[PDB]
Design a protein around this motif. Structure first.
Motif, PDB file in Angstrom:
ATOM      1  N   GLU A 198     -30.017   1.103  22.222  1.00 57.39           N
ATOM      2  CA  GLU A 198     -30.907   0.210  22.949  1.00 57.39           C
ATOM      3  C   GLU A 198     -30.504   0.053  24.409  1.00 57.39           C
ATOM      4  N   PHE A 199     -31.518   0.039  25.270  1.00 54.08           N
ATOM      5  CA  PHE A 199     -31.336  -0.223  26.691  1.00 54.08           C
ATOM      6  C   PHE A 199     -31.701  -1.686  26.948  1.00 54.08           C
ATOM      7  N   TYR A 200     -30.936  -2.291  27.848  1.00 54.58           N
ATOM      8  CA  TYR A 200     -31.141  -3.657  28.319  1.00 54.58           C
ATOM      9  C   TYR A 200     -31.785  -3.628  29.703  1.00 54.58           C
ATOM     10  N   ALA A 201     -33.063  -3.990  29.804  1.00 55.33           N
ATOM     11  CA  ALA A 201     -33.792  -4.107  31.062  1.00 55.33           C
ATOM     12  C   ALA A 201     -33.654  -5.510  31.640  1.00 55.33           C
TER      13      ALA A 201
END
Lengths: 4, 164, 163, 6
Positions: free
Chosen positions: D3-6
């Motif tokens: 997962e990427f954290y924006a």
């Protein structure tokens, strides 16, 4: 059932 | 892109404002508005999104959570920050010779599109709730009342819809 | 309103377009970058109303694929309704450089507590389409994250429900 | 994660  | 508005509502003796809420995709939406309630008076409608209740983010809350926030809210006035039916789209069709625009509906939902119709030409979609027909809200009406509005309409038929 | 485009086949046939059936409409699913499709500005989420004088209502993905694959002549005429499911959300980066969401494979999976995303009512199970008007469909997540990194403090994202 | 954290 119902036609528009 | 389409701007939030603030509503200010007064509780009844049970604390209620005349509102049912639903969790969709980690937001909160208006599910049902009770006739002649404060909710109704401030123009809340099925499909409007509640961004905040008394300044608190509605992000990720369940319906049960949202409802209990309302029930526990201090004082007699409740403030909500509202985004008007963000999923709403409008389609304008024309009745043909038989008086039809071209779609099957049931429980206020579009279930199929008739080939070669104004609805087909306009890309009208299925699995979509009908919100209004020529400026008449059809939310909470039986399909019979919807059919009556349709038949009484003139040739040009503008409907607002949103994904179900 | 819709718009009319007239695509012109490459040699081979193919126009760099994959279509997809959703709720008895037909939608653009993938556009190749230097293709007949890209020339006429087709994008992810665009609804295809008509192909060569025939309505797409009720067509399956398989049928859209075939009509395109079998198109007679050089010209493919289409009537397009621009991303009717598209939504636009404006967020502001906090001090750590974050707007407030978790994504994976181009799709918002959760909204972070007390963030700009939460404030603005960003939703999950939505595909990210553009960041500050820049197409991110087809990019790796890590490319999306660097685009976010080089955007301003004010980040405008375009989203659509997943189907 | 992944997962990427924006």
């Amino acid at each position: 059932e119902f036609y528009a | 892109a389409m701007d939030p508005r603030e509503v200010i509502l007064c509780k009844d003796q049970d604390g209620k404002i005349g509102l049912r809420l639903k969790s969709i995709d980690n937001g909160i939406f208006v599910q049902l508005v009770q006739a002649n309630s404060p909710a109704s008076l401030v123009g809340l409608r099925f499909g409007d999104q509640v961004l905040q209740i008394n300044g608190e983010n509605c992000a990720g809350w369940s319906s049960d959570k949202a409802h209990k926030v309302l029930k526990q809210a201090f004082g007699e006035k409740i403030t909500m920050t509202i985004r008007d039916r963000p999923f709403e789209r409008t389609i304008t069709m024309h009745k043909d010779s038989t008086g039809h625009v071209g779609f099957i509906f049931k429980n206020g939902k579009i279930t199929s599109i008739v080939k070669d119709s104004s609805a087909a030409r306009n890309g009208l979609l299925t699995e979509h709730n009908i919100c209004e027909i020529n400026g008449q809200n059809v939310i909470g009406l039986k399909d019979s009342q919807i059919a009556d509005i349709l038949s009484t309409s003139g040739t040009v038929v503008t409907i607002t819809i949103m994904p179900a």
